Design a binder for this molecule. Structure first.
Ligand SMILES: [Zn+2]
Lengths: 6, 136
């Protein structure tokens, strides 16, 4: 998955 | 029962936190396999698949059914100490446990700082932009 953004 | 602050150290508590987790039976990132990796489900509006390490506090959205949550954890937060806990919980000692919890409290604080920082840099950008427009 991705590292969270915002 | 077990002191609520200490609850996320429990694989079964972490599992229980997955509520309407989209990736079930056929997937590799199943709630079981996810809690085993230290994640808890903490969904938001814009991010309904948001999951977080209870220990290092790294946050990961955008899960794909084929993702192995362990491998995905070593990737996005290799430094995390829970990743090294070989033992099963009740196999630990209180000494070992309190070491761990201290590190958690430290990572938490570290995380708070880290966010406060982004919040800060966000506000800065707005101020910069404003001043520029005002000079234009
Ligand atoms: Zn972690």
């Amino acid at each position: 998955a991705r590292t969270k953004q915002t | 029962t077990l002191p609520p602050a200490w609850q996320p150290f429990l694989k079964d508590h972490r599992i229980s936190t997955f509520k309407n987790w989209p990736f079930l039976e056929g997937c590799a990132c199943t709630p079981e396999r996810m809690a085993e990796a230290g994640f808890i489900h903490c969904p938001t509006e814009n991010e309904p698949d948001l999951a977080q390490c209870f220990f290092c506090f790294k946050e990961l959205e955008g899960w794909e059914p084929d993702d192995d949550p362990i491998e995905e954890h070593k990737k996005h937060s290799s430094g995390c100490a829970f990743l090294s806990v070989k033992k099963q919980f009740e196999e630990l000692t209180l000494g070992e446990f309190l070491k761990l919890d201290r590190e958690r409290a430290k990572n938490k604080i570290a995380k708070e700082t880290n966010n406060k920082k982004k919040e800060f840099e966000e506000t800065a950008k707005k101020v910069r932009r404003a001043i520029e427009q005002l000079a234009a």
